[PDB]
Amino acid sequence: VEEGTKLADEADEKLNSIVGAVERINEMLQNIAAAIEEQTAAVDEITTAMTE
Amino acid sequence: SHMKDVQTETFSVAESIEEISKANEEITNQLLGISKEMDNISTRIESISASV
């Protein structure tokens, strides 16, 4: 019961650490999303300036 | 009098100064249309430079 209680609190930290790790992936993806959108706006205005 | 052979040349240079006058006027008119068209091309190249 003691060996199983402390082994259960081994998985609890590892699952909590995956939430943290994946929200670091998410934090990087939200910056790539804004950057791709801003870059998409800039390339558009160039393709308009080249059509002019 | 002897003014016959004078007259045959003083008829042709009056029928020729007229063609010079007409042609110099056509050159002058073409020049001022080109000057306008060229000064509009300047604007169009400057617009391309702005896009660059």
Side-chain angles (χ1 to χ4, degrees), chain B residues 20-37:
Chain B
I20 301 177
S21 183
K22 198 262 180 174
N24 193 52
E25 180 180 45
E26 288 190 69
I27 294 168
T28 302
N29 281 265
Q30 295 286 14
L31 191 75
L32 293 170
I34 293 174
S35 185
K36 293 166 71 174
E37 208 74 41

Side-chain angles (χ1 to χ4, degrees), chain A residues 1-37:
Chain A
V1 80
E2 181 162 2
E3 161 170 54
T5 300
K6 297 174 176 175
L7 187 51
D9 195 88
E10 194 85 290
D12 185 62
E13 182 169 306
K14 297 292 168 180
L15 292 172
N16 198 48
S17 306
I18 294 165
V19 178
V22 181
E23 289 203 73
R24 291 164 180 201
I25 303 172
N26 202 49
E27 177 166 308
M28 299 292 158
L29 290 169
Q30 293 178 271
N31 285 350
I32 297 171
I36 291 288
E37 184 179 293

Side-chain angles (χ1 to χ4, degrees), chain B residues 1-50:
Chain B
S1 72
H2 301 295
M3 294 292 180
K4 305 184 184 180
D5 310 85
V6 187
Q7 187 166 242
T8 59
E9 317 312 295
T10 311
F11 283 156
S12 55
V13 301
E15 294 178 322
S16 303
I17 198 63
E18 187 48 45
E19 304 183 294
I20 301 177
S21 183
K22 198 262 180 174
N24 193 52
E25 180 180 45
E26 288 190 69
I27 294 168
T28 302
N29 281 265
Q30 295 286 14
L31 191 75
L32 293 170
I34 293 174
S35 185
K36 293 166 71 174
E37 208 74 41
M38 292 305 302
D39 183 60
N40 300 336
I41 289 165
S42 184
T43 305
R44 304 287 166 270
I45 194 65
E46 198 183 296
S47 301
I48 295 170
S49 192

